[PDB]
């Protein structure tokens, strides 16, 4: 009767495809065909943050748009002052194999994780000025690929064990697990309202999740390979995904479809990081060919290139005020652009 | 007039960078190793064992609680001194799976500069099975000859050495299909009880660092 269930699944996905095509009235290219191009976006390196010994895997801005956290495989978390280029904190980690890091929206905690399968939370504001390990969230059976704070007490974690988890930090327990992906999850992205997050995995699929209900609302396909990066559009009704198929794609929740493809014939490397500008007009994508491209999210045109890294671009972040973009690389350097 | 906060931030920066210079000195003296297999008492998500040979520090990492899909977390080990690849020389075709995995690690665009120390183990069982099966998996064996540049160890028939060297050649075919000088395969022979394995790893790491230094010191 497994064949019966496979038949039912194939007919259901055919129904889903027909319902999706019934909504594809006009391509985004046809609706933004008369809007003005953005021209040539030329950005300059304003800061080069040195101090890391090994390759940088993660980088998160603070909500103050001034402080940064970066994770390198030497085993250090550095908290940067982007304006003065100074180092505020350097946190040695128990495991040097950190793959992700996350700055808390309050500014009081910082999380990291990696091949230890543990989300370590660090207190940044202690009465003696010491940075301590507040909590070690264990329970994932695979590596920890992305961390994102909901508030000071809740964090969302993606894993190589194909599951995402919502943690209660004070209790150190796993409140809800999000199953449904088939490959290891690579990146998460929270919505601006913190009620929905989107997940990107190594099965060419992206899933929308209800943080409270614990269920998968929508599943988005269209990529040919593993999705390495995902980011919500500022409105919260769309998101961009970058894959190892040398392509970034704009999806829309309310249409349940893909709206735009960001690809060029001479780009044959995977996308490692994507981020939107404050307006959502630009789409900064980090690539394996050592530089970042700036896309016109509405016209699928390439508006600029951020060259200046001599190894793989791993990290890419835009400040909440939209003032500057930060890039991390395997050459062990953080650069800030404007 | 808050120059106080600025000078305090610069003093904190000075302390941080002093600690960074010292831990940089400690980082450059430690040699990372990845233990990929098909040893724990030789001498969570990842286990770490520290050794010491001739006052040199080595940190070996074997992957623990990870799923068998490796293509994403194997990019973290692109800066290690060497990947130690342990093969049980020989109910599935585990030797061909080993060859496939070695080919994937060898031709990965991120491990393109990472040398591999190959350990072909389980040679007691290999011997007693050769005398008594491998030619049910490799047809070129029944028409293969032991090379002349091979060690004549005392006591063992040409049959077991033929099997050993055929498997070593199966790996060296992958290793030399590239032909570019960027990373090397050091094939070794392991037994059930050995002591020179750490010496072999140390010598191969000395060789890898020396080649890197020839490249770095504009001597190549």
């Amino acid at each position, epitope marked *: 009767e497994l064949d019966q269930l*496979r038949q039912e699944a194939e007919q259901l*996905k055919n129904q889903i495809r027909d319902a999706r095509k019934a909504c594809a009235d006009a391509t985004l290219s046809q609706i933004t065909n008369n809007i003005d191009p953005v021209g040539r976006i030329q950005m300059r390196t304003r800061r080069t943050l040195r101090g890391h010994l090994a390759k940088i895997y993660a980088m998160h801005w603070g909500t103050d748009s001034r402080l940064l956290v970066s994770a390198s495989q030497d085993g250090k978390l550095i908290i940067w002052d982007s304006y003065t280029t100074n180092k505020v904190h350097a946190i040695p980690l128990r495991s040097s194999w950190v793959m992700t890091c996350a700055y808390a929206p309050s500014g009081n905690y910082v999380a990291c994780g990696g091949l230890d399968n543990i989300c370590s939370i660090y207190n940044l504001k202690t009465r003696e000025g010491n940075v301590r390990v507040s909590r070690e969230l264990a329970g994932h059976t695979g590596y920890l690929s992305c961390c994102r704070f909901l508030d000071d007490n809740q964090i969302v974690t993606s894993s190589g064990d*194909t599951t995402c988890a919502l943690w209660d930090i004070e209790t150190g327990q796993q409140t809800t697990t999000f199953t449904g992906h*088939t*490959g290891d999850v690579m990146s998460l992205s929270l919505a601006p309202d913190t009620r929905l997050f989107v997940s990107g995995a*190594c*099965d*060419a699929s992206a899933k929308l999740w209800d943080v409270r209900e614990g269920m998968c609302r929508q599943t988005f*396909t*269209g990529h*040919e*390979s*593993d999705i390495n990066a995902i980011c919500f559009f500022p409105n919260g009704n769309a998101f961009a995904t970058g894959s*190892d*198929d*040398a392509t970034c794609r704009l999806f829309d929740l309310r249409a349940d479809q893909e709206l735009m493809t960001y690809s060029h014939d001479n780009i*044959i490397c*995977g996308i490692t990081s994507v981020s939107f500008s404050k307006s959502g007009r630009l789409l900064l994508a980090g690539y394996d060919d050592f530089n970042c491209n700036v896309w016109d999210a509405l016209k699928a045109d390439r508006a600029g290139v951020l060259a200046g890294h001599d190894n793989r671009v791993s990290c890419l972040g835009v400040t909440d005020d939209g003032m500057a973009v930060a890039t991390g690389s395997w050459d062990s350097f953080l650069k800030i652009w404007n | 007039d808050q120059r106080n906060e600025e000078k305090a931030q610069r003093e904190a920066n000075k302390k941080i960078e002093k600690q960074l210079q010292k831990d940089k000195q400690v980082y450059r003296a430690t040699h990372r190793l990845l233990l990929l297999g098909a040893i724990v008492k030789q001498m969570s998500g990842i286990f770490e064992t520290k050794f010491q040979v001739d006052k040199v520090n080595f940190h070996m990492f074997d992957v623990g609680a990870q*799923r*068998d*899909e*490796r*293509r994403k977390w194997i990019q973290c080990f692109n800066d290690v001194t060497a990947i130690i690849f342990v093969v049980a020389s020989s*109910q*599935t*075709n585990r030797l*061909q*799976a080993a060859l*496939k*995995l070695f*080919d*994937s*690690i*060898w*031709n*990965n*665009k991120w491990l393109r500069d990472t040398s591999v120390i190959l350990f072909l183990n389980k040679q007691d069982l290999l011997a007693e099975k050769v005398l008594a099966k491998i030619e*049910d*998996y*490799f*047809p*070129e064996f029944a028409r293969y000859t032991t090379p002349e540049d091979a060690t004549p160890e005392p006591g063992e028939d040409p049959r077991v050495t033929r099997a050993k060297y055929f498997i070593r050649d199966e790996f060296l075919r992958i290793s030399t299909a590239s032909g570019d000088g960027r990373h090397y395969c050091y094939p070794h022979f392991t037994c059930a009880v050995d002591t020179e394995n750490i010496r072999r790893v140390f010598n191969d790491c000395r060789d890898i660092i020396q080649r890197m230094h020839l490249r770095q010191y504009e001597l190549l």
Partner: nanobody
Amino acid sequence: QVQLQESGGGLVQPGGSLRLSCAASGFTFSNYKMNWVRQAPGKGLEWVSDISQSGASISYTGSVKGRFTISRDNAKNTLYLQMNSLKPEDTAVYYCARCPAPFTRDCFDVTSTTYAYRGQGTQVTV
């Protein structure tokens, strides 16, 4: 959506021949290396064959050399496995595995766990 449909299996006399076919959709077929992976009744997944993006580099596992042959038609998005002189050792489920990323020379796709870019397979019985 990446799909790989395998067809052509069935029951064959010891010594006969088959032709498995793999219909691909949802990706640029000519950009990826394709494979054939096997799963015997009580054993794990074993690799069988491997063809390059163009069809020039071809490799087989040793137990099937001379007997099996692999080909691809990039114009029709299809992969073929012509099997000759079948033995009862060849009784298994034959999957069509695509390598994870395009324009590469490495693949990690024989995982007993769920590998994503692999069809549901066809059964060959001898």
